[PDB]
């Protein structure tokens, strides 16, 4: 995958073996033509399921770090969570000369072991763009509940399997990506919606997939709605109470740069 170009930024999401970093020199040119200046660059990826198959600068996190360092020397790398279990890798570079107001939001989910009754619908013997056939898949699976009529969306059912969908409503976006192979089930969700509490947003996604385990990561900005909520002891929708059938396995809290925080939690279904 997904590309989201906005008035002031770029968000490029990819899966598989695509070498996402090769387009950085071009993104810098894209910012220069409009006479802007890069002030914030973040590269992040959930730990790979098959790291031995990743190509180019992505075969190891030392390669991703070396590469990103060649272009953004000031940046810093982090690893949140268990390194031999579910975790995230972050490389963050910032050249904020002029203090500004940060009210953005970023909610990301990664899910595994998808409901087998659901993986049935993400299969197809033909490539299908947004069409009535996909509408049959959004109703049949529960995606219509996550992406209601108030969103502009375009989706793609792959052959033989795989489902991607993008949605935009005003300045908010929403992206779902699905790998339904039974042996390596996976589904991903990311949105930048303002919400004092993500519980309903998250559970909405979980009902679709009901995965054996999932990881949620939240980026909290200091001047956002959920930013004020979090920084005043209020719940933000990721606390374990909202997930009775899930047991929280490991959680992480990090002020990765002054004023900005990230929360990651790993959940695992019970018995």
């Amino acid at each position: 995958x997904s590309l989201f170009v906005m008035k002031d930024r770029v968000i490029l999401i990819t899966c598989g073996t695509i070498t996402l970093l090769n387009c950085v020199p071009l993104i810098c040119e894209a910012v220069s033509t409009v006479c802007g200046e890069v002030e914030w660059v973040s590269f992040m990826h959930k730990n790979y399921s098959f790291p031995w198959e990743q190509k180019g600068p992505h075969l190891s996190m030392a390669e991703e770090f070396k590469t990103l360092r060649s272009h953004f020397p000031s940046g810093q790398p982090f690893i949140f969570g268990p390194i031999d279990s579910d975790h995230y890798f972050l490389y963050f570079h910032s050249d904020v000369v002029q203090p500004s107001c940060s009210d953005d939001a970023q909610l990301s989910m990664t899910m595994y072991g998808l409901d087998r009754n659901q993986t049935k619908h993400w299969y197809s013997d033909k490539m299908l763009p947004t069409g009535p056939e996909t509408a049959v898949i959004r109703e049949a699976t529960g995606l219509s509940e996550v992406v209601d009529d108030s969103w502009i969306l375009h989706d793609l059912q792959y052959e033989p399997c795989g489902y991607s969908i993008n949605a935009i409503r005003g300045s908010e976006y929403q992206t779902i990506h699905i790998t339904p192979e039974e042996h390596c089930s996976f589904a991903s969700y990311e949105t930048n919606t303002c919400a004092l509490n993500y519980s309903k947003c998250i559970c909405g996604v979980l009902r679709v997939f009901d995965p054996e385990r999932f990881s949620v990561i939240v980026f909290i900005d200091p001047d956002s709605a959920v930013g004020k909520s979090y920084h005043s002891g209020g719940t933000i929708g990721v606390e374990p109470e909202y997930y009775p059938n899930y047991e929280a396995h490991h959680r992480t809290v990090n002020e990765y740069t002054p004023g900005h925080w990230v929360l990651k939690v790993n959940y695992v279904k019970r018995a």
Binding site: E247, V253, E255
Partner: protein, 289 residues
Amino acid sequence: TRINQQTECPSSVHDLVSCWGTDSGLEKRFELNFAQPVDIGTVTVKQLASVMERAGESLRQNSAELGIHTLKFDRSLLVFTAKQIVVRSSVSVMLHEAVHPMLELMRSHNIIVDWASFMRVNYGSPWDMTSETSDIMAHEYAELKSAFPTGHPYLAGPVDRDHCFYFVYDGIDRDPSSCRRENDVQINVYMYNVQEQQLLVSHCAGEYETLRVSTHPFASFETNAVSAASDITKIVNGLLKKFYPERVLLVLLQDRDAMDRLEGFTVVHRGANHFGGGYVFHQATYARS
């Protein structure tokens, strides 16, 4: 310059290290906890001594105090209480070579280790390939994941800056009918480039304050006293004045059953690791203004 070699999966973490894989740490820490408190005299000094010989350390001094046994080696300090064995050493000490022998010693005494940690504080970054830091950490991970398949490694802080790489095994029995409680207190203060000795100071039975000072100079403080938890702000300040370092790393344990600014020091990083077992490991790195 990259082709696909169809290769076997390593059966054990040891096959992965050798098949698919100077030291720049500042200090290594190895801790064991137990399901039931251990008699202080049950584990002799000779047995603990012979377990550190496996990591190339010769006992030099040892004192016996109330609820504590202190063993001083050339490059390491070992505290032994009824609750925990905690050994801190310099990086030239391959402390991972003592993990398994220590576990066997526990087994011979029918002592069940239900919680354990291996921690190393790094000034540098492992991905510096002009240093052996990475290969050492791969060997450390082999001995630990071999001994604690359920254990896990975590990395707190920026990888390219002052940070902690620690490995935690958590096998605590938390059935409601269990009597194993977690009110432990742990406070570690690491001080880089202070402006050589190993010491233990005991004010109460089973509680201690250890201080290590060794070579870039640095000083390493640790305490497990319930009193220390009450006034962390007081003790760190008193430490920074006596030493006056350039950078500082704090680690604060908030256990299950139970640091925003420092003087002349700006925050570089801070964050916590909430473990599933309810306890939290808080960390913050500071640099002088």
